Specification:
Alternate catalytic subunit of the 1,3-beta-glucan synthase (GS) complex. Synthesizes 1,3-beta-glucan, a major structural component of the yeast cell wall. Involved in cell wall synthesis, maintenance and remodeling. The protein is mainly α. Helices cover about 55% and strands about 5% of the residues. Among the domains are: about 250 residues, no CATH class; about 110 residues, no CATH class. Helix 55 crosses helix 64. It binds Lauryl Maltose Neopentyl Glycol (AV0) (2 copies), the ligand CCCCCCCC/C=C\CCCCCCCC(=O)O[C@@H](COC(=O)CCCCCCCCCCCCCCC)COP(=O)([O-])OCC[N+](C)(C)C, ergosterol (11 copies) and a molecule of 2 linked components (NAG-NAG). One ergosterol binds next to helix 15, helix 19 and helix 21.
Length: about 1500
C-alpha cells in the first residue's frame, strides 16, 4: 500500500496532477473520433504520452512536467513547431537569421511576435496543453514516412489543429471513419516518395534508373514547407491553391493535393570538385592566396628586368596580386554555388547581388596593380605609394574572404541563400569552450605559416633564382632545334613549385594533429586524469569513487556506513564477471568483500579485498586476474573512468525512462548445434581461442550436472558459444544489464524498502523488477519476423522466455482488403507477456497500419523508423545488433543521462512575459550524447578517440552513430533516427541536429562493446553546403579538418607523390646532362662557381632531400595520436601492438586473384612510379630516394608477403600453373578527370626524354640534331600497329587462334623495349626515360580511345580488343617480375616455416589443417610442380636475356647504327664518343650550336 501498483505512479499517485488519466484518455479518444485516427495507434500514443508524463514528473512536479512537455513539443523555443511556425507562417526567417548572427558572437517585428506567442501559450489550461501534445503524437504515430520530413508534419499538424478548433468540426455529429487520417492525408505523400524511387513493371515494384538530381527525396520534400512561398505552391486537383481556402477548410482537402505538381528539387548535386570549391572556399583562399604572396616576395627574378634588388614597387605590387587571387576564388565559388540551387527558390537572387559585389572588390584589387605595372617609368612616388597601399588592400581582402562565411557575405546590405531557422542555427560556444576553439586554430596557423615560410619557401629562394635565369647549352631536336631544351631549368622550376603547392596543404594537417595532440594531453593533465601514475594509485582510490560517482549518496538515506554500500556494488560486479566465466574461483575470492566474524562473538564484519589494499602495499606482486584478460580490461577501464569528472546521479525512482532500440534483419540469434560442432569446427575453435573461459564453463557444468544427478546441457553450450560470437542473443543478454543495474542500485540505495519485506525475498524481487520495468525498455526491431524460418522462429521465442520484458517490433503483412490490390502492412509489437495464440504466435499488443511497405531505401534506417513509434521514455540508446554491454558500465547509466542537462536543473515557466530569447538559458538542448565503443575480436577511427575530448568541447563532434544516446523529444520531432533516401559514414551523420540548434556531447566514462564487420558521395550532400558556407571560421575549421580534411589529405598525399615523380624524372634528367658546380658551403650568392661555365643546379638537386623529409614526416605523423592514446591508458607496451596493428593494416589466395584485385589500385601505378624512380636513381643518385624505394616496394610486395603459404617451393610453382591458365582462358567528366592529367604526365615524361638526348654541352652544328621525337613514335605506335595487324589475320583466319595473338603482343612489346635500348646506342639511363615515355604515351592513346568509343560499330568492338592485347602483355610482363622477385628467397631452405612462424606468432596463431593428398595424385604433383618449374625458369631466362643482351652489346666500338641516314631520320640513333663537358677555362666558342 506504500508502493503504488499503478502503471504511471509519478503522475497518477500524485494528488497535485492537473489532469487525471480519465481526462487524458477522453482527450485521446475525442481526437481519434474527430480525425479518424487508428484506434490501435491511439492506444500506442496514449501509452507513450503517459510514460513521458511519468518519467518527467518523476523528477519534477506534475504541473512542470505537463508545462515542460508542451514547451518541448509545441510552444517553446526548443519546439520545432514554433520554429516552423515563425518561418513558414509568419515570414520571419530573415529576422531569425539576424538575431542568430548577433547571438552567435557572444560568450510587426520578431520580438513583438515572440511576445504575442508566449502570451497565447501562457493562457492555455492544462487540458488544452494535453490536447495539443496528444494531437501531435497522434499525427506523429501514423506518419511512418513523413516522420523523416519533420516540417511536412508541422504543416499537417496545423491544418488539423485549425480544422479541429472550427465550428465546421465541433458541430459535426458523425465521427470520421477510422483510418481516415492515414488513408486521406499520409498515404498520398507516401505514394509520392515511393514513386520517386520505384516503378511498376507488370505488377511488382522495382527501382527506377535515374540520376540523383531527378529524385525528389525527403529533404527536397521537407524544404517546401520552410517558406511561405513553398506552401503557396501546394495545388489542389481542381487547379486552385490550398492557401486560397480559409484556415479551417484546408485539412479536409489535403487528400486532393496533387503532390507531383508541387514538390521539386531544392539542391542538385554536380561534379564533386565544384562542391569542394564552394563548400570549403575559405580553405582555398588562405592556402592558395598566402602561397602566392610567399612566393611572389621570394622570387625577385620574375619581375626584375634584365637581371637587381632595388625597385621595391614591383615587389610589393606582385605580392598584392594575392588579393586578386583571393577575390577570384570567391567569384568561382559563387559561380559554382549558382549551379547547385534552383534559380528562383529560397534566395539565389541574393546570389546575383553577391556576384556583383565580388566583381567590384576584384576590380579594386586588379585595377591599381595594372596602373603600377603599366604606368611606371621602367622610384616614382606616384607608383611606389600605390604599390604599398595596394599590398594592404590585398592583405585585408585575404583576411576578409578567409574569415567571413560565403553565405553571410554582404548580407548586411530574402537576404540568405537558405532559411536560417533550419540550416544556420548552430549552437554557439561560450566561455572556456569558445576560447579553446580560438586558441587551437590560432596556434595551428601561426605554427603553419611560420614554418611553411622558413622551410618550404625560404629554402627555395636560390633554386628559384638559379632555375629561372640559366639557359642550357643544348643542341636539341631535328624538328624544333634547341628551343625546348634551353628552358628545361624553368620546366623543372614550374614542376618544383607545383609540388610545393601541394605540400602547402599537407602542412596544415601536420599542425592540426600536432596541436590537437598537445591540447588533448594538457586537457587530461588539467582534468586530473594525467595518467602516468601506476595502477596501484588508481585502484586504491576506487572504493571511495564508487560511493561518490555511482551511488547517488547525497543523503536521502540516513548516512549508512559507506563500506556496506560499496561492498554490495563491488561484489555484484565481480559475481557478474564470475558468472560470465571470466574469473576463476581463486581470482574471485581475493576480489570480494568478505564478511568476517567480529571480535565480539556472534557478530559479522566487512573487510575490503586485498586488491584495494595490496596495490597500496607493493611488497608483493600477486595476480588477482589473468594477464591480458577481459576482466583485466574491464576492471582497469572501470577504475580509470571513475577518476574523471562524472555528474552525480538521481535516485532510481527519480530517473528518466529510456529505451534501447536495436535493428535486426538477418543476424544470428542463437548458435544451433549443427554449426558449432559440425577447417576446425566452431566449438573446438572457441576452446582454442577462449581456453580458460571453457574450463571454468565445464567446471560449472560439472557442478550443475551433478546437482541434477541433455536438453538442458545442449542449450548451455549453444549459449556459451553464442556469447563468444556475434549473435543477437549476446547483445540482448549484454544490454539487459541495464535491468540488472537498475535493480541493484534501487536495492542498495533503499535499505528501508528491502527491510520492509523482511524475509519475503520473492516479493521483493517483484518490487525490484517492477521498478526496472518502469525505467528501462528494450525494443528489438525484427524486420522479417513474419518470414522467419522455423529454426529462427524458435530462436526468437527463446528470447521472449529468457527475457519476458523484451519487446519485438515487426512488419506484419496482411492480405489485400479487395482482390487485385496491394497487401496491407502493419507494425506490430509483441513481448514475453503476450498471450500465445494457437498457431504459436503471440498476439500483438499494438498493431498500427502503414501506408505501404516502409523499406524504400538503404535498410537500417527504414527498420528503425517503423519500430520508432513503440519507443518509450525521454531518451533512446541506438544499438547495433552485434554489440554487448557490461554491468559495471550499465551501472553508470544515471550519470550518462545527466549529460543531456535536464535532470538536475530548475524549472521555469517558458511562457513567462518577462523573459526574452536572448536571456533564456535553454535555447540549445543537447541532442546527442556520444560514448566510446570497444571493438572485440584505421586512421580516423583512432584519430577521433584521442581528440574526442577536445572536439566535443569546441563543437567539433557530429556523430549520430550506434553507440550513443539521443534526446528523443528533440530528435523525433526533427526527422528522427536518420533519413532513408548514399553509404554515409556515421562520423558526420548528426549534423541535421547541429544545423537545427542541438548540441552533441561525448562522455569518456562510458564504453560499450561492438564487434567488427575516393572522396565519397558525402561531399555532394547539402549539409556540407549549409555547414561550409555559413559556419564562423573557428567552427568551420574544426568542421573541415575533422572529417573532410582527412579525406583530402589522403588525396593530396597521392597527388604529391605523382608530382614528385614527374619532377624527379625531369630534375634527374637535367642533372644527368649538366656539369654542376662544386657546391661550396656557407658561401655568398655572387661567389665564384669553380668550373667556369658550370650550371649551379646543386641547390635545385638538394630540393629532393627537403621534399623527402617533408613527405617522410607527413607519413609518420599520422601515428602520433595512435601511440600517445594507447601509451596514456594502457601505459607502456600496448602502444606497440596498436602501432603495429595500424602499420600492418596500411588458405592461400592465388596470384590469379590476389594480383588482379590490386592491379588497378596500387600495382599498376606503383610499377610505373618504380620505373620513374628507377630512372631517377641511375640518372642522378641521391640517398633520400631510398625511402621511396622502401615505400614503393612495400606498396607492391605487401599482398604477396602476407599471403599464407606463398613462399614454399612446392605450392609456389603450382600457383604459377593456375596463373598461366588464368591468362589464356576466358574466351566532359571523363576528359577533365583522368584524360588531361594523363596527357600532362606524358608531356612531362616527353620533355625529360627529349632533353636527355639534347646533347647538352656538345660542340655541334645545326645538322647534329637528333630525331628523338621519332624514337617515341616508332616505339609507341609500332607495337600497337602489329597488335592490330594480327587481328586482321584472325578475321582472315578459340584458344589456339587467340594465344598466338596473345603471345605475339608480349613478344613485340618486349622487342621494342629492346628497340629503344638500341636507338639510344645502348644507354641504360636514356632507355629508361624512353620506355617510361612510351608506356605513358600508349596509356594516353588508349585513354582517349576508350572515351571516344564509350561516349564505327564493327571497330567499336575491335578497338576494345587492340586495347586489350597491349593490356595483356602489361599483365604478363608485370606479373612475372613479381614472380621473378620471389626467386632469391624460395631457394633458402626452411623458409616457409621460417616465414609462417611470424605469420602467426605476432598475430594470434590460427591453424589451418595441413592437407593430405592421394599417393596417386602426389605422383602427379611431383610432375606438374617440376613441369611448370621448367617454364618459370625459362621465362626468367628470356626476361633476363633481354637485359644482359643489350648490356653486353656495349662492345660496339664502331661508331653507331645508321651513320648514313639524312633528313627526318638522320641521327635516329644517338651519337657516341661525344663528351658533354664544355666547361673550364676555355672562353672561346660560347656557342655549342
Ligand atoms: C596568427 C594566426 C592568424 C590570426 C587570424 C586573424 C583573423 C582574426 C579573425 C577575427 C574574428 C575570428 C576569430 C577566430 C580565430 C580563428 C583564427 C584562424 C585563422 C584563420 C586562418 C573574431 O571575431 C570577433 O571576436 C570577438 C571575441 O570573441 C567577438 O566579439 C564578441 O566578444 C567581444 C568581447 O566580449 C565583445 O566586445 C563583442 O561585443 C562581441 O561581439 C566576435 O566573435 C567578433 O567580434 C572574426 O570572426 C568573425 O566576426 C564576425 C563579426 O563578429 C562574425 O559575423 C560575421 O559572420 C556572420 C555570418 O554572416 C555574421 O555575423 C556577419 O555576416 C558577419 O559579421 C563571424 O561569424 C566571425 O567568423
Ligand atoms: C581550389 C582547389 C585546388 C586544390 C588542388 C586541386 C588538385 C586536385 C586534382 C585531382 C584531379 C584533377 C586533375 C586535373 C584535372 C584538370 C585540371 C587542369 C590542370 C591544369 C591544365 C585528378 O587527380 C585524381 O587523383 C586520384 C588519386 O591519385 C587519381 O585516381 C587514380 O588513383 C586512385 C588511387 O590511387 C585509383 O582509383 C586509380 O589509380 C585512379 O582512379 C587520378 O589521378 C585522379 O582521379 C581530379 O580529382 C578527382 O576528381 C574526381 C571527380 O571530380 C573525384 O571522384 C569522385 O567523383 C567521381 C564522379 O563519379 C566518383 O567516380 C568518385 O568515386 C569520387 O571519388 C576524385 O575523388 C578526385 O580524386
Ligand atoms: C631493366 C629495364 C626495366 C624496364 C622494363 C620495360 C619493358 C616493358 C616492355 C613491355 C611491357 C609494356 C606493356 C604495357 C604497354 C602499355 C601500357 C599499359 O597498358 O598501361 C596499363 C598498365 O600497364 C602498365 O602500367 C605497365 C607498367 C610497366 C610494367 C612493364 C615492365 C615492368 C618492369 C618494371 C617493374 C618495376 C621496375 C623496378 C626495378 C625492377 C594502364 O592500364 P590502366 O590505365 O591503369 O587501366 C585502368 C582502367 N581504366 C582505363 C578504365 C581506368
Ligand atoms: C602572409 C601574406 C598575407 C603576406 C603578409 C606575406 C608576406 C611575406 C611573403 C613577406 C612580405 C613582407 C616580408 C618581411 C617582413 C619582415 C622582414 C625583415 C627584412 O629584413 C627581411 C625580410 C623579412 C624577413 C620579410 C619576411 C616575409 C615577409 C612577411
Ligand atoms: C605551377 C605554377 C607555379 C607554374 C606554372 C608557374 C611558374 C612561374 C611562376 C614561373 C616558372 C618560370 C618563371 C619565368 C622564368 C624567367 C622569365 C623571363 C623574364 O623576362 C620575365 C619573367 C619570366 C617569364 C618568369 C615568369 C614566371 C615563371 C614562369
Ligand atoms: C606562386 C608564385 C611563384 C607565382 C604565382 C608568382 C607570380 C608573379 C611573381 C609573377 C608571375 C607573372 C608575373 C608578371 C607577368 C609580366 C609582367 C611585365 C614585365 O614588364 C615585368 C614583370 C611582370 C610585371 C610580372 C609581374 C610578376 C608576375 C605576376
Ligand atoms: C586568415 C589569414 C590568411 C590571415 C590572418 C593572414 C595571416 C598572415 C598575414 C599572417 C599569420 C601568420 C604570419 C607569419 C608568422 C611568422 C613570420 C616569420 C617571418 O620571417 C616571415 C613572415 C611570417 C611567416 C609571417 C607572415 C604573415 C603571417 C602569415
Ligand atoms: C613540346 C613541344 C610540343 C613544343 C616544344 C614544340 C614547339 C614547336 C612545335 C613549335 C613552337 C615554336 C616553333 C618555332 C620556334 C623555333 C624553332 C627552331 C628553329 O631552328 C627553326 C624554327 C622552329 C623549328 C619553329 C617551328 C616549330 C616550333 C618550335
Ligand atoms: C603543374 C605542372 C604540371 C605545370 C603547371 C608546369 C608548368 C611549367 C613547367 C610550365 C607551364 C608554363 C611554362 C612557361 C610559359 C612560357 C615561357 C617561354 C620562355 O620564355 C621561358 C619558359 C616559359 C617561362 C615557360 C616555363 C615553364 C612553364 C612555367
Ligand atoms: C586563379 C588561380 C590562381 C586560383 C583561382 C586557383 C585555381 C585552381 C588551383 C583551382 C581553382 C578552380 C579549380 C578547378 C575547378 C573544377 C575541377 C574539375 C575536376 O574535374 C578537376 C579539378 C578541377 C579542374 C579543379 C582544379 C583546380 C582548380 C583549377
Ligand atoms: C596556383 C596553382 C594553380 C598551381 C601552382 C598548381 C597547380 C597544381 C596543384 C595542379 C595543376 C596541374 C595538376 C596535375 C596535372 C597532372 C598530374 C598527374 C596525374 O597523374 C594526376 C593528377 C596530377 C598529379 C595533377 C596534380 C595537381 C596539379 C599539379
Ligand atoms: C608537365 C607538362 C604539361 C609541362 C612540363 C609542359 C608544358 C609545355 C606544354 C610547355 C612548358 C614549357 C613550354 C615551352 C618553353 C619555351 C617556348 C619557346 C617558344 O618559342 C615556343 C613555345 C615554347 C617552346 C614553349 C612550348 C610549350 C611548353 C613546352
Ligand atoms: C625478345 C625478342 C623479340 C628479341 C630477340 C627481338 C630482337 C629484334 C626484334 C630486335 C632487337 C634489337 C633489333 C636490332 C637493333 C639495331 C639494328 C640495325 C639496323 O640498321 C637494322 C635493324 C637492327 C638489326 C635491328 C633488328 C631487330 C632487332 C634485332
Ligand atoms: C633471349 C633473347 C631475347 C636475347 C638473346 C636477345 C638478344 C638480342 C635482342 C640482343 C643481344 C645482342 C644484340 C646485338 C649485338 C650487336 C649489334 C650491333 C648492330 O649491328 C645492330 C644491333 C646488334 C645486332 C644488337 C641487336 C640486339 C641484340 C641482338
Ligand atoms: C669537366 O671539365 C672541367 C674542366 O676540365 C673539370 O673542372 C675541374 O674540376 C676539378 C674538380 O675539383 C677542379 O679541381 C679543377 O680546377 C676544374 N678545372 C677547371 C679548369 O676549372 C670538371 O671536373 C669536369 N667534370 C667532370 C669530368 O665530370
Amino acid at each position: 500500500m506504500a508502493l503504488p501498483n499503478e502503471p504511471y505512479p509519478a503522475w497518477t499517485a500524485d494528488s497535485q496532477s492537473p489532469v487525471s488519466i480519465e481526462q487524458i484518455e477522453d482527450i485521446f479518444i475525442d481526437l481519434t473520433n474527430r480525425l479518424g485516427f487508428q484506434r490501435d495507434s491511439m492506444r500506442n500514443m496514449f501509452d507513450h504520452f503517459m510514460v513521458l508524463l511519468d518519467s518527467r514528473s518523476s523528477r519534477m512536479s506534475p504541473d512542470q512536467a505537463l508545462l515542460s512537455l508542451h514547451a518541448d513539443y509545441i510552444g517553446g523555443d526548443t519546439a520545432n513547431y514554433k520554429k516552423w511556425y515563425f518561418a513558414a507562417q509568419l515570414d520571419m526567417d530573415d529576422e531569425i537569421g539576424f538575431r542568430n548572427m548577433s547571438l552567435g558572437k557572444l560568450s510587426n517585428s520578431l520580438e513583438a511576435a515572440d511576445f504575442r506567442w508566449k502570451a497565447k501559450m501562457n493562457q492555455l489550461s492544462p487540458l488544452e496543453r494535453v490536447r495539443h501534445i496528444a494531437l501531435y503524437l497522434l499525427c506523429w504515430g501514423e506518419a511512418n514516412q513523413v516522420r523523416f520530413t519533420a516540417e511536412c508534419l508541422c504543416f499537417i499538424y496545423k491544418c488539423a489543429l485549425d480544422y479541429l478548433d472550427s465550428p465546421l468540426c465541433q458541430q459535426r455529429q458523425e465521427p470520421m471513419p477510422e483510418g481516415d487520417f492515414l488513408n486521406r492525408v499520409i498515404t498520398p505523400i507516401y505514394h509520392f516518395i515511393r514513386n520517386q524511387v520505384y516503378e511498376i513493371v507488370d505488377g511488382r515494384f522495382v527501382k527506377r534508373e535515374r540520376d540523383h538530381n531527378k529524385i525528389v527525396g525527403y529533404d527536397d520534400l521537407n524544404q517546401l514547407f520552410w517558406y511561405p512561398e513553398g506552401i503557396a505552391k501546394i495545388v489542389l486537383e481542381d487547379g486552385t491553391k490550398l492557401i486560397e481556402l480559409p484556415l479551417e477548410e484546408r485539412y479536409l482537402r489535403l487528400g486532393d493535393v496533387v503532390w507531383d505538381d508541387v514538390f521539386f528539387k531544392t539542391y542538385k548535386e554536380t561534379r564533386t570538385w565544384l562542391h569542394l570549391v564552394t563548400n570549403f572556399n575559405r580553405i582555398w583562399v588562405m592556402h592558395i592566396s598566402i602561397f602566392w604572396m610567399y612566393f611572389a616576395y621570394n622570387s625577385p627574378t620574375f619581375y626584375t628586368h634584365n637581371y637587381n634588388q632595388p625597385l621595391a614597387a614591383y615587389k610589393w605590387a606582385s605580392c598584392a596580386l594575392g588579393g586578386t587571387v583571393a577575390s577570384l576564388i570567391q567569384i568561382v565559388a559563387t559561380l559554382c554555388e549558382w549551379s547547385f540551387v534552383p534559380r528562383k527558390w529560397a534566395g539565389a537572387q541574393h546570389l546575383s547581388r553577391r556576384f556583383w559585389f565580388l566583381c567590384i572588390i576584384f576590380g579594386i584589387n586588379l585595377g591599381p596593380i595594372i596602373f603600377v605595372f603599366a604606368y611606371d617609368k621602367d622610384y616614382s612616388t606616384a607608383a611606389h605609394v600605390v604599390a604599398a597601399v595596394m599590398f594592404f588592400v590585398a592583405v585585408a581582402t585575404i583576411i576578409f574572404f578567409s574569415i567571413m562565411p560565403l553565405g553571410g557575405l554582404f548580407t548586411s546590405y530574402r537576404r540568405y541563400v537558405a532559411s536560417q531557422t533550419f540550416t544556420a542555427a548552430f549552437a554557439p560556444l561560450h566561455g572556456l569552450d569558445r576560447w579553446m576553439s580560438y586558441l587551437v586554430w590560432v596556434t595551428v596557423f601561426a605554427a603553419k605559416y611560420s614554418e611553411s615560410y622558413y622551410f618550404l619557401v625560404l629554402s627555395l629562394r636560390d633554386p628559384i633564382r638559379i632555375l629561372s635565369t640559366t639557359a642550357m647549352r643544348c643542341t636539341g631536336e631535328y624538328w624544333w632545334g634547341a628551343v625546348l631544351c634551353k628552358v628545361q631549368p624553368k620546366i623543372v622550376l614550374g614542376l618544383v613549385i607545383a609540388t610545393d603547392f601541394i605540400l602547402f596543404f599537407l602542412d596544415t594537417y601536420l599542425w592540426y594533429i600536432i596541436v590537437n595532440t598537445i591540447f588533448s594531453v594538457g586537457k587530461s593533465f588539467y582534468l586530473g586524469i594525467s595518467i602516468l601514475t601506476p595502477w596501484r594509485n588508481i585502484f586504491t582510490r576506487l572504493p571511495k569513487r564508487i560511493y561518490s560517482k555511482i551511488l547517488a549518496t547525497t543523503d536521502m538515506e540516513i548516512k549508512y556506513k559507506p563500506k556496506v554500500l560499496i561492498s554490495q556494488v563491488w561484489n555484484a560486479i565481480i559475481i557478474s564477471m564470475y558468472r560470465e566465466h571470466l574469473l576463476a574461483i581463486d581470482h574471485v575470492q581475493k576480489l570480494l568483500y568478505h564478511q568476517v566474524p567480529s571480535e565480539i562473538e556472534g557478530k559479522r564484519t566487512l573487510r575490503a579485498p586485498t586488491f584495494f589494499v595490496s596495490q597500496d602495499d607493493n611488497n608483493f606482486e600477486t595476480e588477482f586476474f589473468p594477464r591480458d584478460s577481459e576482466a583485466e580490461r574491464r576492471i582497469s577501464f572501470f577504475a580509470q573512468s571513475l577518476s574523471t569528472p562524472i555528474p552525480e546521479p538521481l535516485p532510481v525512482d527519480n530517473m528518466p525512462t529510456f529505451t534501447v532500440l536495436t535493428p535486426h534483419y538477418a543476424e544470428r540469434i542463437l548458435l544451433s548445434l549443427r554449426e558449432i560442432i559440425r577447417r576446425v569446427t566452431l566449438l573446438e575453435y572457441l576452446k582454442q581461442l577462449h581456453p580458460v573461459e571453457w574450463e571454468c564453463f565445464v567446471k560449472d557444468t560439472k557442478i550443475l550436472a551433478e546437482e541434477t544427478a541433455a536438453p538442458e546441457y545442449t542449450l548451455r553450450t549453444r549459449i556459451w558459444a553464442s556469447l563468444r560470437s556475434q549473435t543477437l542473443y549476446r547483445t540482448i543478454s549484454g544490454f539487459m544489464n541495464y535491468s540488472r543495474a537498475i535493480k541493484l542500485l534501487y536495492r542498495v540505495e533503499n535499505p528501508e524498502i528491502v527491510q520492509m519485506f523482511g524475509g519475503n525475498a520473492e516479493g521483493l524481487e517483484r518490487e525490484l523488477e517492477k521498478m526496472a520495468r518502469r525505467k528501462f525498455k528494450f525494443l528489438v526491431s525484427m524486420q522479417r519476423l513474419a518470414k522467419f524460418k522455423p529454426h529462427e522462429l524458435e530462436n526468437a521465442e527463446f528470447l521472449l522466455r529468457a527475457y519476458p520484458d523484451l519487446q519485438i517490433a515487426y512488419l506484419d503483412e496482411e492480405p489485400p482488403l479487395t482482390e487485385g490490390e496491394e497487401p496491407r502492412i502493419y507494425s506490430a509489437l509483441i513481448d514475453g507477456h503476450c498471450e500465445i495464440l494457437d498457431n504459436g504466435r503471440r498476439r500483438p499488443k499494438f498493431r498500427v497500419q502503414l501506408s505501404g511497405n516502409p523499406i524504400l531505401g538503404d535498410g537500417k534506417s527504414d527498420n528503425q523508423n517503423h519500430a520508432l513509434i513503440f519507443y518509450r521514455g525521454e531518451y533512446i540508446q541506438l544499438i547495433d545488433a552485434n554489440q554487448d554491454n557490461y554491468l559495471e558500465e550499465c551501472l553508470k547509466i544515471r550519470s550518462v543521462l545527466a549529460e543531456f542537462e535536464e535532470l538536475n536543473v530548475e524549472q521555469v515557466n517558458p511562457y513567462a512575459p518577462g523573459l526574452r530569447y536572448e536571456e533564456q538559458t535553454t535555447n540549445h538542448p543537447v541532442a546527442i550524447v556520444g560514448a566510446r565503443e570497444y571493438i572485440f575480436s584505421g586512421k580516423e577511427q583512432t584519430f577521433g578517440t584521442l581528440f574526442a575530448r577536445t572536439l566535443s568541447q569546441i563543437g567539433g563532434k557530429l556523430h549520430y552513430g550506434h553507440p550513443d544516446f539521443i534526446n528523443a523529444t528533440f530528435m523525433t520531432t526533427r526527422g528522427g533516427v536518420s533519413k532513408a533516401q548514399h553509404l554515409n559514414e556515421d562520423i558526420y551523420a548528426g549534423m541535421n541536429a547541429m544545423l537545427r540548434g542541438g548540441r552533441i556531447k561525448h562522455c569518456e566514462y562510458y564504453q560499450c562493446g561492438k564487434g567488427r564487420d575516393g572522396m565519397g558521395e558525402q561531399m555532394l550532400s547539402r549539409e556540407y553546403y549549409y555547414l561550409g558556407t555559413q559556419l564562423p571560421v573557428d567552427r568551420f575549421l574544426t568542421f573541415y579538418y575533422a572529417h573532410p580534411g582527412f579525406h583530402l589529405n589522403n588525396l593530396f598525399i597521392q597527388l604529391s607523390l605523382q608530382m614528385f615523380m614527374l619532377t624527379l624524372v625531369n630534375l634527374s634528367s637535367l642533372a644527368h646532362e649538366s656539369i654542376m658546380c662544386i657546391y661550396d658551403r656557407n658561401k655568398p650568392k655572387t661567389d665564384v662557381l669553380v668550373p667556369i661555365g658550370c650550371y649551379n643546379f646543386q641547390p635545385a638537386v638538394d630540393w629532393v632531400r627537403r621534399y623527402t623529409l617533408s613527405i617522410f614526416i607527413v607519413f609518420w605523423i599520422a601515428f602520433v595520436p595512435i601511440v600517445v592514446q594507447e601509451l596514456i591508458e594502457r601505459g607502456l607496451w600496448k602502444a606497440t601492438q596498436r602501432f603495429f596493428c595500424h602499420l600492418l593494416s596500411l588458405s592461400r589466395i592465388p596470384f590469379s586473384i590476389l594480383y588482379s584485385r590490386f592491379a588497378g589500385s596500387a600495382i599498376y601505378m606503383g610499377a610505373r612510379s618504380m620505373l620513374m624512380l628507377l630512372f631517377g636513381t641511375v640518372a642522378h643518385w641521391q640517398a633520400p630516394l631510398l625511402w621511396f624505394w622502401a615505400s614503393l616496394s612495400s606498396l607492391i610486395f605487401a599482398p604477396f608477403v602476407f599471403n599464407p603459404h606463398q613462399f614454399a617451393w612446392e605450392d609456389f610453382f603450382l600457383d604459377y600453373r593456375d596463373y598461366i591458365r588464368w591468362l589464356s582462358r576466358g574466351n566532359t567528366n571523363l576528359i577533365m578527370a583522368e584524360i588531361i592529367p594523363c596527357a600532362i604526365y606524358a608531356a612531362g615524361c616527353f620533355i625529360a626524354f627529349t632533353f636527355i638526348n639534347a646533347q647538352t654541352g656538345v660542340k655541334t652544328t645545326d645538322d647534329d640534331r637528333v630525331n628523338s621525337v621519332l624514337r617515341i613514335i616508332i616505339c609507341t605506335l609500332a607495337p600497337i600497329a602489329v597488335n592490330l595487324g594480327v587481328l586482321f589475320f584472325c578475321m582472315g583466319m578459340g584458344s589456339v587462334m587467340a594465344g598466338i595473338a596473345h603471345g605475339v603482343a608480349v613478344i613485340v612489346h618486349i622487342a621494342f623495349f629492346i628497340v629503344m635500348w638500341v636507338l639510344e646506342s645502348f644507354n641504360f639511363v636514356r632507355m629508361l626515360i624512353g620506355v617510361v615515355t612510351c608506356i605513358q604515351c600508349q596509356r594516353l592513346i588508349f585513354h582517349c580511345m576508350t572515351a571516344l568509343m564509350l561516349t564505327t560499330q564493327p571497330s567499336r568492338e575491335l578497338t576494345a580488343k587492340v586495347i586489350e592485347l597491349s593490356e595483356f602483355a602489361a599483365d604478363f610482363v608485370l606479373g612475372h617480375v613479381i614472380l621473378i622477385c620471389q626467386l632469391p628467397l624460395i631457394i633458402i631452405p626452411k623458409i616457409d616455416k621460417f616465414h609462417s612462424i611470424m605469420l602467426f606468432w605476432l598475430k594470434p596463431s590460427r591453424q589451418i589443417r595441413p592437407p593430405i593428398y592421394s599417393l596417386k595424385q602426389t605422383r602427379l604433383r611431383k610432375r606438374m610442380v617440376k613441369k611448370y618449374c621448367s617454364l618459370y625458369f625459362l621465362v626468367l631466362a628470356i626476361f633476363a636475356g633481354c637485359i644482359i643482351g643489350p648490356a653486353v652489346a656495349s662492345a660496339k666500338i664502331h661508331k653507331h647504327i645508321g651513320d648514313s641516314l639524312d633528313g627526318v631520320v638522320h641521327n635516329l640513333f644517338q651519337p657516341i664518343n661525344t663528351t658533354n663537358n664544355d666547361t673550364g677555362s676555355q672562353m672561346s666558342t660560347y656557342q655549342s650550336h
